[model samples]
Target: DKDEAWKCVEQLRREGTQIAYRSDDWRDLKEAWADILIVDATDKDEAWKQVEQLRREGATQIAYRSDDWRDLKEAWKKGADILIVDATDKDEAWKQVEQLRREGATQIAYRSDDWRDLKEAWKKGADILIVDATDKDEAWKQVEQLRREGATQIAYRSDDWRDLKEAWKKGADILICDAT
Candidate 1:
C-alpha cells in the first residue's frame, strides 16, 4: 500500500493536481512533509474500490454505505465528503435532513423517487434532489416546477442504458447510477 500509494501521490504533485488527504497522525505529515485521515482507508478495502470506480465514472459526490444507518456522528467520525440522509419513516428522514441545515451549508440530498415529498424536501433545505428521471416529458415538467418554486440541483438516478443520455437531455444537473 505504501509503495505505490506514495508514487501515485507524487504523480499527483507532478501533474499540478489538487489533492486533499485526511490524516490525524501529526507525525506522518512531519515525516513526509505532506498534507492529509482518521484510520487505514483499507479497513474496508472493498468499499474503497467502490469509491474508486465511482470516481472513474465521474462521481462528484458520494454517499456513505447503505449499511451505515448511523447517519450523523458515525459518518462524520470519518471524513465523509457528503451525506445522504437515510431513514425509513418520512418524519424521521425529514428530522435527519433538517439537522444538516442547522449544521450549515452542506450537501444534503433528498432522494424521493416518487417525488411526493419534493415540496417538503425543498422546504426542509435540501441542496439536491435525486429523482427517478427516466421519461423526458416528466423530467421537463418537474424541472420546470422546481425552477418556478425555487432553484435546487436535480439528479437523475437511473439504470436504463439510454436513460443515462436521457438524464442529461432532460435537464438533470447530475446523475447517479450504482452499476458500473
Candidate 2:
C-alpha cells in the first residue's frame, strides 16, 4: 500500500473502524453504521482530513477510499492497518492485495468476480468480497457457495426492498440498500 493510505488506516484503527476500504459515503457507514466511518475524497490528504473531522464527531473506526494501486500503497505507507483496493485489472488488484497481506494488513476488501481471483482471495485471505448477482436466488446461491468456501463475510447491493429482505434472510452479515 501507499504511505498516505497506510496512515489513513492507522488513524482509523487507532480511533477503531476495524477495517478500511473503498466505498461510497452512503454505505453502512451512515444510518447506524456502528462506530466506524469511511469517507470519500478526491485525494489522500482530503480523505485524511474528512476522516479526522469524523473522528472529532466520535467515530471509533474509519477507512478511506483506495481506488487504485498507487493509493493503496500510499495508504499502506501512511500506516493503514486495513487495505481496500478497487482496480480495473483483476490480477493486478490481487497482486496489490497479496502485497498488503504480506505487509500485515489485518483487513482487506477485494473487488473481483473472476473464478481464479475468487479462489485466490479465499486462499490468500480476504475479509469481504463485494460481488453482485441478478436477484435473490442467484445471490443466495453465490452466498452459500462463498460461505462453503469459508468466506468470513460477503456483501451485495439491493435496490429493491424485497431483494434486500431476501438477502437479509439468506444471512448476509452486511446489507447494502438504496433509499429509493
Candidate 3:
C-alpha cells in the first residue's frame, strides 16, 4: 500500500496540471492526468471549448467555477466535473454549490487555502476540500481535523517536494505542486 501511494505521488509531480509541471513533462504526461486543471476561461462559450478540449487532451479532472448563474449551470454541460471555489467567492459560492447539488453534481470542491476559511468551507459540507499548504504542519493538522469530521477527499497544494510527502501522509486524494 505504501509503495503504490508513493508511486502515485511521484507520478502526480510528473503529470499534475498545466501550471504544476514542466512544459516538456506536461507534453509527454498529457496522456495521464494526475491532477485537476481549472479552466482559465471565464466566458461561458470559451470555457465550454476549453473544458471540452481538456478532456479530449486526456485530462482526468477538469474544474470550471463561476458564481454566474449561467456558467454555474452551463459548466457541467461544458464537461467540467469539479468546481474549484473558495472563501472569496462564498457569497455566491454556496448558492452555486447547492444549485449544482440540485442539478446532480457529485463533488463539491471548495477552496480553503486561507488559514481561517477551513471552518468556512466545512460548514457547507464541502466534501472535497482544496488547501494551500504553505502553512505546512499547521495546515495539515487542520486538514486532519476535517478528515476526522468525515471529509475523506482532501487536496493539498505545496510547491515543495517535502510538502508533497506531508500531504500524502495526511491522506491527500489530490496534490497540487507548482512553483507558481
Candidate 4:
C-alpha cells in the first residue's frame, strides 16, 4: 500500500489533480509534488516561522493549525496564509470565527469531525472547512452538498485511497490523510 501511494500520487498529478499533503515536515516533497502543505504548530511564533520557511521553499498554500482562538490572531498577523482551527465547542468556535472575520481575517478554516458544523462553519464566514468523516458514505454526500452550497475550500480526512479518490471527485479542495 505504501508503494502504491507514490504511484497514486503520480497518477493524481498526471491527471491534473491538486494534492494536499498533511505533514508538518518537508519529507513528503522528496516523494512527490504537493500543491498544499499542512502543518501543526504549538504556538503562534512557531506556526509563523514554519509558514514563512515553507513559502520561501516554494509551497504555494500553507494551512497552519490553531487549536483555539488564543493562537489565531498572532498566527494570522505573523503571515499564516490559512489558519486551521479545531474546536470541541461549536458555538464558541463559530463566535470566534465571526469575530475574526469582522476583524478582517479572511482565510479562517474551521476543522471539525462533526458533520453538523460543516455548513454552519461555512455560513459563519469560514472560507475553508476541514472535516474528519467517520462515515464514508455520509461524508461523501455532505462534501458534495457543501460544495454545492458555495463552500470554496473543503478538506476531508481519510487514509484509504478509494475514499481519497472519491473525495476528490466530490469536489474536495483538500484531501487530508494520515502519514502512516
Candidate 5:
C-alpha cells in the first residue's frame, strides 16, 4: 500500500503535480516531501542530500527551513525551491512571512497545533490544510470537518500505514508512517 502511495507522491514530485499526506508528518510542512517540498527544520541535515538528488533528477518546488533570518538567507542562497518560517507568535510570524513573500519567498508557512493557529495561518496566506489524529476514525472526522471548512487540499499522517491504506480508500487525502 505504501508502495502505491509512494508512486503517487513520486509522480507528483516528478511531474510538479499536487498530492497530500497525513498531518503528523505533513502538518510540520517541512516533513511533507510533497509535490512541493515543505521542509521542516528537523529535516535540515538529512534532507540536503535528498534535495540535491531530487534536483539532479529534475525535481521542482524544493522548499526548506527558514526559521530565522540566517536560515532564510542561507536557504535562498542554496537555491531552495521554497522558503518556510516556523514562528511561535502568530502576528509576528505572519508579518515576517509577508515580508519574506514580498522579498520573493516562493512558498511559505507558519505552523501551530491550535485551530487558532490555523485561523492565523490562513490569514497569513497559508493554502494547504494539514490535520493529524490518533486513529482512523478521528482522522476521517477531521478530514470531513476540514472539507466543511472549505479546505480543498488536505493531508494527514499516522503511524499506522496499514489502516492508512484503508483510510485512503475512504478519502483521507494521504497517509504517512515512519519506516520501521
Candidate 6:
C-alpha cells in the first residue's frame, strides 16, 4: 500500500500542493512527509510520541483524532496541536471543548455532515468545522452563520465543483475536495 500510495502523494507534492496525511500507524511517516499530520492514536504516551516525532520531522501542524472525549485532554496535554473530534455527540463534545479550553488546549476541530449539528457546533466552540455539503445554498448559509458565531475555519467537502465554488464564495478557509 505504501508503494502504491506514495506515487499519488508524490505527484500532488510535486504540483506545489500541501497535503494532510492521516494514518493510524506511527511508522508511516518514514515513507512520506506531510504538511499536516492527522494521527489516530489511542494510547496517551504513543500519541504524545507521534506528535513530538512529527513536529521534529517538520510537520507544520499535528491533529489527533479521538472518538472518546476522555482521550482529548490527554492528547492535548501530550502536545497534539489540534483535536479532531467526532461531531455525532455534540453535547458531550461541547463540554469537552470547554474543559479543554480551561486546561489551555486551544485548537479543536469537528467532522460533521449533519446540518442539525451546525448551530451547536458553532456555539460549542470548535475552532474548525469539517463539513460535507451536498446542497450548495444551504452550505453557504451555514458557512456564513458559523463564521458569525466565531468558527475560525470551515473546511468544506463536496463531490461537485459547483458546491465547492459556492463554498469558496461563502468564504470557507479550506476545501476538502473529494478524490472522485
Q: Which structure among the candidates has the greatest lDDT?
A: 4
Give a tens-digit lDDT track for model 3, residues 35-151. Answer: 566664345666677777776876777776554544745766767777655446556766655666667776666766653465555565456677677666666775676667666
Global Cα lDDT for candidate 3: 0.59
**Each prediction's whole-model lDDT (CA):** 0.48, 0.52, 0.59, 0.69, 0.50, 0.64
Candidate 6: deviation at residue 159, Å? Answer: 8.7
Off by over 4 Å in 2: 1-36, 73-82, 114-116, 133-137, 178-180
Specify the highest-TM-score model's number.
Answer: 4
Candidate 5 per-residue C-alpha lDDT over 106-161 given as tens digits, one digit per residue, 9 for 90 to 100: 55544433445544555566554344445445555555555566655444445454
RMSD (Cα, Å) for all candidates, in order, is 10.7, 9.2, 6.4, 3.0, 6.9, 4.6
**TM per prediction:** 0.54, 0.64, 0.69, 0.80, 0.54, 0.67
Worst 10 residues of 4 by lDDT: 24-33
Clashing residue pairs found in predicted model 3: none
Question: Candidate 5: lDDT over CA atoms?
Answer: 0.50
Badly placed stretches (over 4 Å) of model 6 are 1-19, 27-32, 42-45, 132-150, 157-170, 175-180
- lDDT over C-alpha atoms for residue 2 of model 4: 44
lDDT of 2 by residue, 69-119 (tens): 566556545444345565457677777677767766766766553434655
Which is superior by lDDT, 1 or 4? 4
Please list the residue runs of candidate 4 whose C-alpha ends up more than 4 Å from where it truly belongs after superposition. Answer: 1-11, 26-33, 43-45
- In candidate 6, what are the lDDT values of residues 1-180, reduced to their tens digit? 445445545544454433455666677754544555676666767777887777777665777877666687767666678787765676776676666666667787777776447556556666777676765457767676666666667766554445655665676665544333
Record all residue pairs in model 5 with backbone atoms less than 3 Å apart, i.e. clashing: 21-156, 22-156, 22-157, 23-156, 23-157, 30-38, 30-39, 30-40, 63-82
